[PDB]
């Protein structure tokens, strides 16, 4: 036998930062949960117990929050880079770092229509994720997200002309109700190291921005014809505004309310145009996935 | 051996309910989960196997949405009390209805900022809650409640002055950050019967929203000596606005963040005035509790 | 506006001990989650601010991992008891201590048909519980209880006989899945303080496995006329073979297996006699209560 | 821009199915949680509102209890192999199938010494997962695995001689706790089709029960050097015993249990040699992978 793969370090390390202004008072805060995987030449850690090879995983967690003091914490796409490049340039045989961050919603309180200086709410479970592989020789790959975005729409949304035959019993309809939970990332072009993502630096917020907003748009103002169908206006609109990305990749459950027959109640209307009362359904759900990249 | 209690039902009874006005094409949608617990004399159908006492599980689901049809599902207060009503005087040996409703957040969508027709967004897991107790000839007892309502301030708190032992380690501190989920729960008076619940209507939604700017500016604008001596000066200010609660009650969790000492590590400076990453702590926490009522 | 009731203390505090005998080499581990919340004279901590009457949550924590390395933790009855007593007995005015235990299985393995000396296997979530109230003056009360406990019988349940109205739509049946999460609590006699609880040592881990035995028994063998029948015969016998019990109460989930009818492709029979594959149902179900105590 | 990959189907679809032997009256269940996804010519139903190319999800459902229906659902490698070669035998234009069940645990109950014929226990959260790829004219990748296995053991694991520099604060140790929740995957070699999948029916669940042994008996004998040593001698054990699996993957938390220096309170011993209570840590972890493949 032969180790054909291995990585190993640190997950779910959370970390808080606080940025204070002297000059106006106002402090701002970041949250995050950080993973930091490490490939290089370690295989004998695994075949011959040799642990010289091992940089603890308690000392990457050491890193991680060290890292977090020297460096901005945002966008997270650069303190991503930054802490994957420490890695393979501090240890001679770690040849690949791969850095997961979940950045969590502190957002600032409105106190009296005033911006509060420093409290803060968490409004939704939305995170905005990077995933930062930093290869030696092979430059920084970054792939930005955002998850947790919930969302409906009560009309507006359609499904019918799909295959019919013997397994199939799902009625046609022009008129129903569609919710999701969205999951977007999209995916920059390679990056030939730390300089050059610093160059980008403003483009990631923006980016970011730029697809919530357009996901947000195109699901409310869209006359959907499918999932399928939704979803691939939302992957067309992100690439075309902003050309440092490469491909988009949406995976969206389609979460499912069901209308209630009530008719067997005193005749109660209550399905097609009638319908008033649904039942969400927790299980079983759609899922629709779609990677758009350039022709 | 005897039945000294007894209550049974349906839990989990996910609703949706959507509103069109087909005047200005505007849509609204209310979704909530349900549990319905029924009381009175049902003790036979456990000690002898007698089922006919038993209003079977699934026809009380039944009346749920059958009641969502027929009725306005908010205030959730009233939907609470028409649906507990409802069992006590349709079955003569159902004495006691116990209905519980959680309020799931869909919040209309601003598009170019217009709000949007028909397009809603999860902006949170924080839920406004009710639990109605309808008993046969008591009337009509009502716990309204806000919960998963998470906060953070980064500074203004303070804990020092408590007692100090042989098992006191904790170091006094003038300047900390504060963080929970707020769980507060409002008691309104007696109620005779539906009737005079319908009399208050207008009450209901002004409360809650009362009761939530309490808790924000509260927390936001006290210079805190405690999570204990800041949660009692939002119950005082919520009894004050709303002659018709007897009790308000808090249940709030101190999250902790703990700082992290790195001066091992090149005598980095990251304690006391020069803190700036913190470790969250998922567990333990704090746990403090108060119940408010009138002199 | 007056404080009417407070309490607080520290809760989700993990704790895993480990006892080693020297003679057999054989380790033996436990893992609990304790809530400790206290209660006295400390009303003037919310209204004043002041902190010279909190006992720390950080110390309440510190206590119980010296409380556990000083005192044995088994049975969980009588660590929680000695807990509790020595937060009354050590503060002047603290005058009730409320301990939750929630006890975690570490079974050990058997390897090659032998135990093992210090290897072990989480068999199930199912957890052993205790809730302990230590008031000044009014001796100690204790709930047992067993929760988590998952179980399935795919016949000899009925369900027949029950109030059919014009809400009522569920069919009656001869033989339907049964399945539960079951939730059970027995309430010990009040106890006059620390000594009698120790006189009662052996009596509460022979408790527990009766509990848990009569309920596997009961829900295997009885050809069960619903939940509530069947449940009644398992409190029953608990109370039976334990006088020092008071009470026993049991909480249970209805979890619904539907049928499903796939009579619509090619004639295919999936119904009654003919049932073999089935739709688990994750909402909403029945929950069925009751507490039994002495005539 | 241009669909560069594209899936969708059905998620968290949940099954149950009873084998009923008329013979002895025995009955046996299994529940499974199924996804499904399709690939092929489905890329005009994003890019041009054409559903004509599109097998409903929820006929996809239907399917797979269809499925469960006329085919035995055990073993789950056998049940995933005839699920995926339905859908792309059936439909031309439909190229691959990805089928993923979660099989739980219903583990026939012992009473008063006898298995019991139709009552059953869920022992634990431990899962056996398949994920089954048939893609058309390339056969069938089946990934076999078990999960949620959570063991721990209180002696015999060290860790020493790993690197040090300026972020490491860790201590060496040769006696420390080691708990982990087990993730192990064996990739079997590519099966030409359906009969070469039935040709090894009886390979699939020895292997499971091999696997499952292999990992039990290394964790408690080996003397454990690292996390890294210890799998990799699971990997190697799994790879000799079954000549029909490529490779073997393990994903192993570290669930750290940390010393409590109790010495501050009147000098307590209880770290080192003395160390009986701990503090289980929930984040951060370790996380320690490895592939382990032939020569
Ligand atoms: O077994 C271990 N492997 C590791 O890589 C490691 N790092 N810190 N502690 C550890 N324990
Ligand atoms: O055992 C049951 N008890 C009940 O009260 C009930 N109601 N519907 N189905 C049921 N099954
Ligand atoms: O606000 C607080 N209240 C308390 O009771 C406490 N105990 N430790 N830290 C604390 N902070
Ligand atoms: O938008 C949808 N896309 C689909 O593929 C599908 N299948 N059933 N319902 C559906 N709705
Ligand atoms: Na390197
Ligand atoms: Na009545
Ligand atoms: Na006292
Ligand atoms: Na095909």
Redesign the interface.
């Given at each position: 036998?032969?180790?054909?793969?291995?990585?190993?370090?640190?997950?779910?390390?959370?970390?808080?930062?606080?940025?204070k202004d002297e000059k106006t008072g106002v402090?701002t805060?970041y949250?995050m949960t950080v993973?930091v995987?490490l490939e290089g030449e370690?295989e004998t850690?695994?075949?011959k117990?040799?642990?010289?090879?091992?940089?603890?995983?308690?000392?990457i967690?050491?890193?991680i929050?060290?890292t977090?003091?020297?460096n901005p914490v945002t966008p997270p796409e650069l303190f991503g880079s930054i802490l994957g490049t420490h890695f393979i340039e501090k240890?001679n045989h770690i040849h690949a770092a791969h850095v997961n961050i979940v950045c969590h919603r502190?957002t600032r309180?409105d106190?009296?229509g005033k911006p509060?200086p420093?409290?803060?709410?968490?409004?939704?479970?939305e995170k905005r994720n990077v995933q930062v592989d930093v290869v030696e020789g092979k430059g920084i790959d970054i792939k930005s997200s955002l998850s947790g975005?919930?969302?409906?729409?009560?009309?507006?949304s359609q499904?019918?002309?799909?295959?019919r035959?013997?397994?199939?019993?799902?009625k046609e309809t022009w008129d129903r109700?569609l919710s999701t939970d969205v999951d977007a990332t999209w995916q920059w072009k390679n990056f030939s190291g730390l300089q050059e993502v610093r160059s980008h630096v403003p483009k990631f917020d923006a980016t970011w921005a730029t697809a919530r907003e357009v996901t947000?748009?195109t699901?409310?103002?869209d006359n959907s014809?499918?999932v399928?169908?939704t979803?691939?206006k939302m992957?067309?609109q992100i690439?075309?505004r902003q050309q440092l990305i490469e491909?988009v990749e949406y995976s969206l459950?389609?979460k499912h309310?069901f209308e209630?027959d009530?008719s067997?109640?005193?005749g109660?209307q209550?399905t097609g145009k009638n319908?008033?009362?649904?039942?969400?359904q927790?299980?079983?759900?759609?899922?629709?996935?779609?990677?758009?990249?350039?022709?």
């Open positions: 036998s032969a180790v054909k793969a291995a990585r190993y370090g640190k997950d779910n390390v959370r970390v808080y930062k606080v940025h402090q805060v949250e993973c995987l370690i850690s695994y075949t117990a040799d642990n010289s090879v091992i940089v603890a995983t308690d000392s967690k050491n890193t929050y060290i977090a003091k020297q240890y502190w309180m106190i009296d509060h420093h409290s803060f709410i968490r409004d939704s479970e975005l919930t969302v409906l729409k009560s009309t507006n499904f019918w002309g799909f295959l035959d013997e397994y199939t019993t799902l109700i947000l748009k699901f409310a103002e014809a499918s399928q169908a979803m691939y992957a067309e690439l075309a491909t459950p389609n309310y209630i009530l067997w109640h005193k109660l209550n319908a008033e009362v649904f039942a969400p927790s299980d079983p759900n759609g899922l629709i996935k779609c990677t758009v990249g350039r022709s």
